[PDB]
Structure formats: C-alpha cells, structure tokens
Amino acid sequence: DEAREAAAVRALVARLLGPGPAADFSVSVERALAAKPGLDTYSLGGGGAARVRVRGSTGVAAAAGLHRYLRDFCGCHVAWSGSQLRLPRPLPAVPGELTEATPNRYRYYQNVCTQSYSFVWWDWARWEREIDWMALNGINLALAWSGQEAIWQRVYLALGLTQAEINEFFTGPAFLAWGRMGNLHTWDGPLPPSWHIKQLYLQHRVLDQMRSFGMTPVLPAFAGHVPEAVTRVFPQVNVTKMGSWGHFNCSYSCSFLLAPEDPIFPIIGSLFLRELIKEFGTDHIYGADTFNEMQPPSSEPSYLAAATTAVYEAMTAVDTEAVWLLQGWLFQHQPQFWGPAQIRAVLGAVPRGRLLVLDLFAESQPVYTRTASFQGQPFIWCMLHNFGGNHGLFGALEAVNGGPEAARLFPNSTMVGTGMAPEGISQNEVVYSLMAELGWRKDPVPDLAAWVTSFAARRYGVSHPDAGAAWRLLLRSVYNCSGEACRGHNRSPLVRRPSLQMNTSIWYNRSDVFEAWRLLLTSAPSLATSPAFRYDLLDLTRQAVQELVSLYYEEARSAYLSKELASLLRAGGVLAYELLPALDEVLASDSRFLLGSWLEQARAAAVSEAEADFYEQNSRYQLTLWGPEGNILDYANKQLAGLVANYYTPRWRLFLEALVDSVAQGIPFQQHQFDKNVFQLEQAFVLSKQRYPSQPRGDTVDLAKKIFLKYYPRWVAGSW
Numbered sequence: 001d002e003a004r005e006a007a008a009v010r011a012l013v014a015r016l017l018g019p020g021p022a023a024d025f026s027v028s029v030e031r032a033l034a035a036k037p038g039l040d041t042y043s044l045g046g047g048g049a050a051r052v053r054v055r056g057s058t059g060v061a062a063a064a065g066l067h068r069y070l071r072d073f074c075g076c077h078v079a080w081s082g083s084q085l086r087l088p089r090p091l092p093a094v095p096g097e098l099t100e101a102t103p104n105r106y107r108y109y110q111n112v113c114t115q116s117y118s119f120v121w122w123d124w125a126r127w128e129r130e131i132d133w134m135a136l137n138g139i140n141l142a143l144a145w146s147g148q149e150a151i152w153q154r155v156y157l158a159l160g161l162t163q164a165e166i167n168e169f170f171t172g173p174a175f176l177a178w179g180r181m182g183n184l185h186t187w188d189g190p191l192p193p194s195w196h197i198k199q200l201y202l203q204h205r206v207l208d209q210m211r212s213f214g215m216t217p218v219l220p221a222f223a224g225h226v227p228e229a230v231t232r233v234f235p236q237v238n239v240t241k242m243g244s245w246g247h248f249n250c251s252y253s254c255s256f257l258l259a260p261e262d263p264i265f266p267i268i269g270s271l272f273l274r275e276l277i278k279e280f281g282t283d284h285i286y287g288a289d290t291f292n293e294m295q296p297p298s299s300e301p302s303y304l305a306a307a308t309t310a311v312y313e314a315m316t317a318v319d320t321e322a323v324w325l326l327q328g329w330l331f332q333h334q335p336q337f338w339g340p341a342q343i344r345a346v347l348g349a350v351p352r353g354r355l356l357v358l359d360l361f362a363e364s365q366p367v368y369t370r371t372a373s374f375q376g377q378p379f380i381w382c383m384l385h386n387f388g389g390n391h392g393l394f395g396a397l398e399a400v401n402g403g404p405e406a407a408r409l410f411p412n413s414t415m416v417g418t419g420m421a422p423e424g425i426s427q428n429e430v431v432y433s434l435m436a437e438l439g440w441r442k443d444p445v446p447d448l449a450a451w452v453t454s455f456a457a458r459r460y461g462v463s464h465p466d467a468g469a470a471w472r473l474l475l476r477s478v479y480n481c482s483g484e485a486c487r488g489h490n491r492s493p494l495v496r497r498p499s500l501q502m503n504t505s506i507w508y509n510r511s512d513v514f515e516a517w518r519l520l521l522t523s524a525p526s527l528a529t530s531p532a533f534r535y536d537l538l539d540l541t542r543q544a545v546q547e548l549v550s551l552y553y554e555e556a557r558s559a560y561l562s563k564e565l566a567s568l569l570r571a572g573g574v575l576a577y578e579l580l581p582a583l584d585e586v587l588a589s590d591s592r593f594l595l596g597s598w599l600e601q602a603r604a605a606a607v608s609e610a611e612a613d614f615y616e617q618n619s620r621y622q623l624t625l626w627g628p629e630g631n632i633l634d635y636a637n638k639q640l641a642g643l644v645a646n647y648y649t650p651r652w653r654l655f656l657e658a659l660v661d662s663v664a665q666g667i668p669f670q671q672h673q674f675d676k677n678v679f680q681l682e683q684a685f686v687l688s689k690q691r692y693p694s695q696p697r698g699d700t701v702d703l704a705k706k707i708f709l710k711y712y713p714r715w716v717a718g719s720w
C-alpha cells in the first residue's frame with residue numbers, strides 16, 4: 001500500500017545518501033497525486049531552510065522524483081560503475097511545487113539474455129543495488145527470472161521424471177537464458193543442488209523488494225517446450241522436434257515442442273504456474289516465448305493461432321487476470337517466415353489488451369511500424385542497444401531520442417511504455433542514462449550536445465571544458481550510428497578470430513575517438529580522483545587501443561600480401577607484442593575491467609572448490625567458444641584483463657607467426673589449418689584452471705598516458 005511504498009523509498013534514500021543526510025528528505029506516497037489512473041506522477045517542494053519534499057503517486061514515482069531532484073538540482077549522478085553523490089549545503093530550494101507525470105504506463109527493464117550474460121553470479125547484495133538503480137530510473141515493470149528451474153524441478157518430479165532426467169535437461173548456469181526459450185538443453189550442466197537453494201533465496205528477496213516499491217515483476221510461464229523424458233511418462237504425447245539452434249547438434253538443441261492441442265499441454269502449463277505461484281505469489285504478468293529464433297513447424301495461420309492460444313489458456317486456466325508479455329524479437333529475426341498473416345494469427349489469438357508485446361529492437365528494427373501497431377495489441381517500445389554484453393563504444397542516440405515520440409504519433413498507436421533491454425549491462429552508461437530519461441519525458445531531449453555535457457559534468461562532479469568537449473566528440477561519432485544496419489555487436493579485429501578477411505570499417509571518423517582521448521587525458525590533473533573519470537578514461541583508452549589494433553591489422557595484412565617481411569614483423573610485432581599487452585596491463589589497473597572480478601563472483605556463488613571450478617569454466621565458455629565446438633564463437637566477447645592476455649593475444653601471436661612463416665618460406669597461408677591450431681588455444685583458455693586476479697594493479701592515469709604518448713604521434717604522422 002501507500003505506506004509500505006513510502007517506507008521503501010525512505011530506506012532507498014538512507015542506502016543512497018546515508019541515514020544522516022536522509023533526514024533532510026520528507027518522502028510520501030499518495031495515490032491522488034496522479035491526475036490520470038496509472039500515469040505515475042511525482043512532485044518536489046521545499047529545500048533551502050526546509051526539508052526537501054518528495055511525493056509520488058507510487059513508490060517508483062517517488063524514487064524517480066528523488067532522482068530528478070538529485071540530478072537537476074544537486075548535480076548528482078548514479079550509474080552501474082559508481083555514483084557521484086555530493087550534496088550542497090544548504091540543499092537547493094525548489095520554486096513552488098514542481099510536479100511531473102510520465103506519459104508511459106510502463107517503463108520496462110531487462111532482456112532474457114541479461115539474466116545469463118550479466119546477472120548469472122549476482123548475490124542479493126548486487127541485486128539490491130540494481131533494484132535501487134531501477135527505482136531511481138522510474139522502472140515499474142521488469143523480469144524476475146531467478147529460480148524458475150527450481151520450480152520446474154518440482155513440476156517434473158511430480159510428473160514422474162527421475163532426478164537424473166531432470167539434471168541432464170537443464171543447461172549450466174551461464175546458458176539458462178537459452179534453455180528457458182527451448183533453444184538449448186543440457187549444455188554444460190548439470191545445475192548443482194546449491195544453485196537452486198541460492199536462486200530460490202534470491203528470488204524471494206528480489207520479489208519482496210520490487211513489490212515494496214510498487215514495481216510489477218514479470219514471472220515466467222510454460223511456452224510448450226518439454227524434455228524428451230516427458231515422452232517416457234506420457235508416451236502418447238504429440239511432439240515436434242525443432243531444428244538445430246546455434247549450430248548445436250541434437251544432444252544440446254532440437255527441442256521437443258508439445259503440440260498445442262495435446263491434452264497434456266494445459267496440464268503441464270497449469271502445474272508449473274500453480275507451483276510458481278504457491279512459492280512466489282504473482283502480479284498477473286507472465287512472460288513466455290515459443291519460437292524465439294526457431295522456425296515454427298508450419299506457416300498455416302490456424303496452426304500458429306492454436307500454438308499461441310494454447311499458451312495463453314494454460315495461464316488463464318490458473319490466473320484469470322493473466323496478461324502475457326511477449327517478446328517481438330522473432331518477428332524481426334525471421335521476417336521471411338513472419339509474414340502479415342502469420343503475425344496476425346498470433347496477435348489475434350489472445351484477447352485485445354491481454355498480450356503486451358515488447359518491440360524489442362525498436363530503435364533500429366521496429367515492428368509496430370509494419371503491423372499497424374501490433375494489430376491493436378498494446379506494446380512497449382524498447383531500446384535493445386547492446387548484444388552479448390560486448391565492450392565497445394557504440395550508440396544510435398539520434399534514433400533513440402526520436403523513437404518513443406515517433407511511436408506515440410504513429411496512426412492508431414497502442415504504445416503503453418518504453419523499455420531498455422540490453423543483452424548485457426555494465427557498458428555505455430551514457431546510452432542508458434538517456435533512454436531511462438525518455439521513460440519520464442514528454443518530448444525528445446532538445447539539445448543532445450548540451451545534454452551530454454551535463455551528463456559528464458554530474459558524473460565527474462565538475463564541468464571541465466576538455467572533458468565536456470571529449471563527450472561532445474564521442475556523441476557525434478561513436479554514439480551517432482545512423483542507418484538501418486546499426487548493431488551494437490563488437491566485430492572489431494581485437495575480439496574476433498584473426499583472418500585475412502576482417503572488415504575494419506566503422507560508422508564514424510576514427511580521428512574523433514583519438515581527439516576525444518587526448519581531451520579526456522588532458523582533464524586528468526583535475527579529475528583523476530573521480531572513480532567515474534578513471535572508468536571513462538580507461539574505457540576510452542581501451543577504445544583507442546581497439547582502433548589501433550584495426551589500423552595495425554591493416555598494415556600487417558598489406559605487408560603479408562606484398563611479401564614485405566620486415567614491414568610485416570614490425571606491424572604485426574607491435575600489434576601482438578606491444579599493443580595487446582599494453583591493453584591488458586591498463587585494464588588490469590581497475591577492478592571493474594578484471595576478468596577475475598567476474599570469476600570471483602562465480603566462485604562465491606559456488607559452495608565448494610569443484611563447484612567453483614565448474615562455474616568458472618561455464619563463464620569462460622560463455623565469453624569465448626560459447627558452445628563445445630565454437631558454436632557461437634566470440635559472440636559474448638568482452639575486453640577484460642586476463643581475457644586479453646590469455647585469450648585474444650595468443651590468437652594474434654599465432655596468426656602473426658603463421659603469416660611470417662608463410663612469407664619466409666615459399667608458402668601460402670592456409671586459413672583452414674590456422675583455424676584448427678587457433679581452436680586448440682581458444683579451448684585451452686576455456687579448460688585451464690588458472691586463477692585470475694580480482695584486485696587491481698598499477699595506476700590507470702599513468703598507464704593511459706604512456707599508451708597515448710607512445711601511439712598517438714604515430715596516428716597523427718601515419719608512421720606505424
């Protein structure tokens with residue numbers, strides 16, 4: 001109720017600022033503050049000689065008001081990487097009563113993938129910080145995906161499956177996103193008993209905390225995928241075996257899909273939802289997806305309607321208030337299958353307003369556009385932005401700034417909210433800061449250059465003219481990809497398998513990055529004490545090294561092709577023996593860029609050495625080979641200390657060496673042979689029991705300065 005929501009926001013203020021400064025805020029929650037039912041509203045008053053009055057129509061609204069006040073009146077900044085929470089004394093006064101309402105019924109957060117790429121090894125402490133970030137960003141709808149395998153285990157045991165069948169079925173922890181969608185099964189499991197104990201524990205705390213703010217946590221439901229062992233206990237079920245996803249064979253993919261009209265369908269679907277709800281309660285919104293990246297066995301509208309009605313009916317068969325949150329990714333991913341009549345069949349099969357669809361990649365491939373606003377079903381306009389959790393400076397900020405407005409103005413628009421659905425978090429914080437803001441604004445931000453200048457100013461605690469100019473440069477270059485082919489996948493040579501056919505082209509002027517780097521480095525004598533400045537300088541230096549690797553690749557390749565041995569040794573030499581080690585070393589100077597920081601999260605999730613080794617191996621697979629044969633090679637690449645020294649660099653050394661051997665003998669370089677040798681090194685990184693440091697070493701500013709002094713003059717002079 002109102003009181004519990006206000007107490008939740010009061011406790012947020014105390015975690016955020018300390019209990020001392022928290023006493024200067026008067027928080028309340030009052031339903032009547034909203035003019036229109038379900039359009040969240042906050043108001044700010046007071047300050048100066050008086051306490052700061054923050055009122056919300058809900059707990060999330062109040063938290064958004066708090067953020068509004070801290071950002072625009074106090075100059076504060078909150079992000080995944082850290083915060084800048086200096087309060088002026090006295091606290092600034094607000095003129096009269098400032099009251100703002102969102103035009104969005106929902107602000108949504110999380111991809112299904114984010115659960116595996118970023119949240120896998122999170123404990124409660126980390127989730128608690130994330131739910132605060134969510135509340136401050138005004139989020140009222142989000143996935144609560146933890147612990148669902150523990151519920152499926154109860155269901156399957158009750159259906160007569162053996163514990164061994166259940167253990168064989170789930171993937172390892174790092175691959176559960178794809179197990180849950182039916183893309184995968186089995187790969188790199190089993191889930192150990194401690195996993196379920198910890199995830200059930202976690203999920204209860206997540207749900208309690210979300211609900212205390214008045215957030216709506218979305219819960220999973222059955223979408224038709226079942227383990228093969230279901231055909232042992234129910235041997236007359238009608239099932240179709242799906243195709244291979246992600247180049248996995250039938251030991252790991254080729255999922256069994258239960259036919260929509262099989263009598264077992266509502267029985268399994270109902271038993272799962274009932275067990276889920278007994279354990280966790282419900283807020284009446286359920287997520288399910290049958291055909292994410294998997295071609296349905298028929299394009300007949302009548303079949304596709306029945307497959308969709310079967311899932312919705314299983315939900316309403318236990319909860320008559322059910323609303324089904326559906327990912328729209330498939331419509332964009334297999335456009336040749338998903339013609340107008342196929343899409344109309346799914347969208348028409350659930351009553352209007354009971355399908356809430358995520359237009360998941362709306363900043364670049366919106367579907368509302370080509371389906372007359374999902375044939376009248378409500379939708380949430382999502383920015384996807386990031387794939388694989390990849391590091392790399394990227395954004396299409398003009399398209400995100402104008403996107404929600406265009407969706408709202410579209411004829412017969414059924415837009416009911418905005419969302420952020422990155423595959424991984426902990427990158428490109430500027431992009432999420434903007435899209436979160438668009439959650440509450442009526443209009444696009446009018447001047448992006450001034451906005452990014454203020455973003456940097458609040459983040460560093462000072463408006464520096466060089467740092468400001470650096471960010472304006474990044475805004476118009478890396479953060480302004482335009483066109484239909486803008487994807488935030490890092491495909492740079494640094495993170496990919498070396499070859500003679502790598503494409504080094506980009507969507508911006510490379511000089512803008514090197515200038516931005518120079519300008520940000522010039523700011524260091526003022527800003528070096530800001531953890532956020534250190535983070536951004538490191539991220540930008542890292543980007544500059546990524547650019548240099550590409551440029552040195554170009555030189556090495558041209559020299560290979562001309563049989564210029566000395567030039568090839570020189571160019572390939574600085575790439576593999578100087579640039580890459582320099583990168584690893586500078587990354588190693590901050591805890592937020594250590595492979596070892598993430599792997600120690602994995603060890604702390606385990607309860608034994610053996611289990612910890614298993615989780616760490618899971619993590620190393622996920623970042624590199626993905627599957628056992630390099631099935632989705634480098635898709636979840638990252639630029640972390642340890643990973644660059646022991647994975648990216650050995651591949652480049654081997655590649656250079658094979659090129660110089662080729663030029664030195666008579667002999668052409670053969671890709672297929674190098675492909676076999678480099679696979680041994682990639683796999684060795686995965687299977688090694690090497691431990692990686694979780695403590696930083698060296699000074700970030702000093703190391704970045706050395707890289708700049710050495711490589712920047714070579715850039716301006718063209719002399720490699």
Ligand SMILES: *[C@@H]1O[C@H](CO)[C@@H](O[C@@H]2O[C@H](CO)[C@@H](O[C@@H]3O[C@H](CO)[C@@H](O)[C@H](O)[C@@H]3O)[C@H](O)[C@H]2NC(C)=O)[C@H](O)[C@H]1NC(C)=O
Pocket residue numbers: 249250251628629
């Ligand atoms: C589906 O894919 C998996 C993973 O690639 C296959 O399992 C793998 O099978 C291979 C070949 O049998 C094993 O590799 C090695 O083969 C040599 C044979 O000369 C042997 O000396 C080594 O000890 C080793 O066994 C590999 O261990 C195994 N990998 C895993 C992760 O289990 C599987 O066979 C494929 N399934 C189908 C149905 O095709």
Ligand SMILES: *[C@@H]1O[C@H](CO)[C@@H](O[C@@H]2O[C@H](CO)[C@@H](O)[C@H](O)[C@H]2NC(C)=O)[C@H](O)[C@H]1NC(C)=O
Pocket residue numbers: 372411412
């Ligand atoms: C927006 O919605 C309305 C649905 O009411 C569509 O207009 C109806 O359909 C045709 C026009 O193409 C007319 O014969 C009906 O009489 C219209 N109804 C009304 C009340 O005007 C309209 O076409 C939709 N726009 C788009 C782009 O699909």
Ligand SMILES: *[C@@H]1O[C@H](CO)[C@@H](O[C@@H]2O[C@H](CO)[C@@H](O)[C@H](O)[C@H]2NC(C)=O)[C@H](O)[C@H]1NC(C)=O
Pocket residue numbers: 398448449475476477480482
């Ligand atoms: C993002 O890119 C687009 C394309 O370069 C920019 O939009 C142009 O802005 C100029 C003014 O400088 C206008 O005269 C043009 O009409 C626009 N061009 C096109 C092709 O649309 C935009 O300024 C860039 N955004 C940022 C924030 O730097």
Ligand SMILES: *[C@@H]1O[C@H](CO)[C@@H](O)[C@H](O)[C@H]1NC(C)=O
Pocket residue numbers: 238239259260261303
């Ligand atoms: C299985 O279900 C599909 C419809 O989903 C149907 O085409 C097929 O005839 C059914 N097969 C059997 C053996 O019942």
Ligand SMILES: *[C@@H]1O[C@H](CO)[C@@H](O)[C@H](O)[C@H]1NC(C)=O
Pocket residue numbers: 503505
């Ligand atoms: C790299 O890709 C771009 C389009 O994305 C294309 O125009 C270009 O020709 C490609 N370069 C090479 C060398 O193949």
Ligand SMILES: *[C@@H]1O[C@H](CO)[C@@H](O)[C@H](O)[C@H]1NC(C)=O
Pocket residue numbers: 509511512
């Ligand atoms: C990129 O920046 C450099 C240096 O300011 C400039 O010489 C060049 O003409 C710029 N633009 C393009 C499209 O190359």
Ligand SMILES: OC[C@@H](O)[C@H](O)[C@@H](O)CO
Pocket residue numbers: 063064065066067068136137138433436437438439440441
């Ligand atoms: O406006 C204040 C609210 O806290 C949020 O919606 C921000 O605008 C974006 O973080």
Ligand SMILES: OC[C@@H](O)[C@H](O)[C@@H](O)CO
Pocket residue numbers: 113293387388423632635
């Ligand atoms: O590539 C496998 C990834 O984990 C997913 O994000 C999707 O398959 C991308 O389309």
